Amino acid sequence: MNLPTAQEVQGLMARYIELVDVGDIEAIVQMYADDATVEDPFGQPPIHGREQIAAFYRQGLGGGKVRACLTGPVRASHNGCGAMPFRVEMVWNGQPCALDVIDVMRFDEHGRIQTMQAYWSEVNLSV
Amino acid sequence: NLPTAQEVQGLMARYIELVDVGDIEAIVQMYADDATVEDPFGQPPIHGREQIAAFYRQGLGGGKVRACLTGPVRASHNGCGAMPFRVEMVWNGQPCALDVIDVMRFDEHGRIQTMQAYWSEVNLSVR
Ligand SMILES: C[C@]12CC[C@H]3[C@@H](CCC4=CC(=O)CC[C@@H]43)[C@@H]1CC[C@@H]2O
């Protein structure tokens, strides 16, 4: 496909969350442009390219069992960008917990994620 | 006074309350002199306090517009944050709701440097 329409952005970002929930790092990486940037959490040095994005997320969604679900609709623009609210449930000190996140994504003219920012900090972690 | 993550949470929630009340001059006072507003994200940025003032005056011109958070503010440690909320208004003679995510960057004075409002007609619904 091409630069995603607003409806297409909603579908792509919803699919992304489904991939996080099942832990399919390979499929997440293929959603990214080969030269994408990830800032997760926003404020940390950017991660650059599919190899480093794969390595980074195999530390997480491979090491432990994690879940994720949208907590509201995907907001989508007409320039191939969108933003979504979601919640991640995981193990914290041998104790389940919840993290509230918003990802902002910009897609390229091939329908792949060019940039992603994940807004969250410990203020968004609850036990 | 580069807002901490907890201070960003308070600043962004305070902004939604000012929108809900509709105090346009109180809203504009939150922005820095050289701030930009992109709303909806994808449209050319607005800059200059009075242009920002006129923009809010046209949207909240009374004009029964309501706004409320629909999730917690996500906040970073570099003075930025993102929040999901819901706008209630009347359009086409129909009571409507609009789901939005705002992304904001604050300056070292605690004032809004950049605002980006993610939404489009895919986020419109009748109530
Ligand atoms: C202008 C408007 C009311 C104010 C909203 C705007 C959507 C974006 C938004 C985001 C803010 O941060 C301020 C309030 C406006 C609506 C789109 C249509 C509606 O009338």
Curated annotation (Swiss-Prot), chain B:
Induction: By steroids. Gene3D superfamilies: 3.10.450.50. The keyword Transmembrane helix does not apply. It comes from the Bacteria. Substrate binds at residue 102. Keywords: Isomerase, Lipid metabolism, Steroid metabolism. Its EC number is 5.3.3.1. The active site is at residues 15, 39. Changing residue 126 to A: Slightly reduces activity and reduces protein stability. Changing residue 102 to A/L: Reduces activity 100-fold. Reduces activity 10000-fold. It is an enzyme of class 5 (isomerase). Pfam families: SnoaL_2. One of its GO terms (biological process) is steroid metabolic process. CDD domains: ketosteroid_isomerase. Signal peptide: none annotated. It catalyses: a 3-oxo-Delta(5)-steroid = a 3-oxo-Delta(4)-steroid. GO terms for molecular function: steroid Delta-isomerase activity. Homodimer. This is Steroid Delta-isomerase. It comes from Pseudomonas putida (Arthrobacter siderocapsulatus).
